[PDB]
Amino acid sequence: VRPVWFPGNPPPAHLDGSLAGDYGFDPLFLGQEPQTLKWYVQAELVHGRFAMLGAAGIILTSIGAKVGLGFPEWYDAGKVVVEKNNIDFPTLMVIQFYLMGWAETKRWYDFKNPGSQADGSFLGFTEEFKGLENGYPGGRFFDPMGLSRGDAAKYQEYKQKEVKNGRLAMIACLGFAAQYAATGKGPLDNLADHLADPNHVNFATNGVSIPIA
Template structure:
């Protein structure tokens, strides 16, 4: 699984490359502790990665992404309509520069994505084995209360210690790693392709987990049962035939899509205005 590929952070470039992209430049992040600088985590040759369609997420021509998203991050397609990469995030090492903030946000995306990949596999496996929908699995397993509580407490304590070590690694080495190791790549799978694939699989898994939770709310069934129902009757079993709950979900997703695109239009307008002012200065 690509989840064992170590976390990658990015610096920023300032040279325009072909097709309107920004050519990656080498930068390193100063960190605390034993290490004097963090490793350079940009893709080594992002221009050689095979892509389908546009290099950006925006469907219109002449798209100009945020200047800090220069195409050198794995999975970077210029998507940041709310400018979170420039304004949000607080790295645990106390760094306040945009480069460190973007690296910390990427660490969060990868970590949540890896958990989502594990969760998706677990959800599908539980239902496939006939243990019922994923949210009823703990009850269906009929684990004694004492054993269950002991397992939960032990798991939380173990993960708390591992997370503490991850924070210490970030402060000392500029990357969190896993299982107390940073960097974490025991079998040498770190390549541009794998780094790109991991980010994409992380995002897909997070969307899948959101879809599973939405299905549970709307239909009260697990993803496999829903898939069987839909395949048997595609026009009678879908999100648009689920009554008020289905309508509510559709409305929420449409509203979010509108807000997302409106925010991107506003960001581009503000960026164009800023460029115009600098040009007149």
């Protein structure tokens, strides 16, 4: 019925299409156990959401570099920001783990005991941390515009859109790393080269990806 990653192959039993972005792709049966599948569903969303922020940030700053606004490449921004602004790297790293540790520990114990973070313990907030589904916090803090509290049909459509752009972003972030390692240039520097001579400038001719070439 519903489309699958490999046309003609029946989907796995444990993937019934209820989840967003379900194409029955689980060749290694990593999520056969129902409780483990909940953990990975949220792991995919967190991975996808971070990748979308990463890809958008890398793309935008790369446009700034090409246009000449002075932005550094994503693989040099860390060094430039610290030196130019005179920031102690170990202090910045520690601050990150306090803020991430607090925010991400709360997400951890909401997964273990759903609704536990909405008991008013944290500064008296009792409804912004209740959670709607697994991986979808909802609420008037994480969803201020209430797009998850309006139409039910369109909210399900967005869940499909979120996961697929997340998976695409995850692949893109792997492309940025692989392209930098093979080429040593920025993302849009590679795109400009390909558009110049697509036939003679690509991975099959970089001298790295296909060593036998």
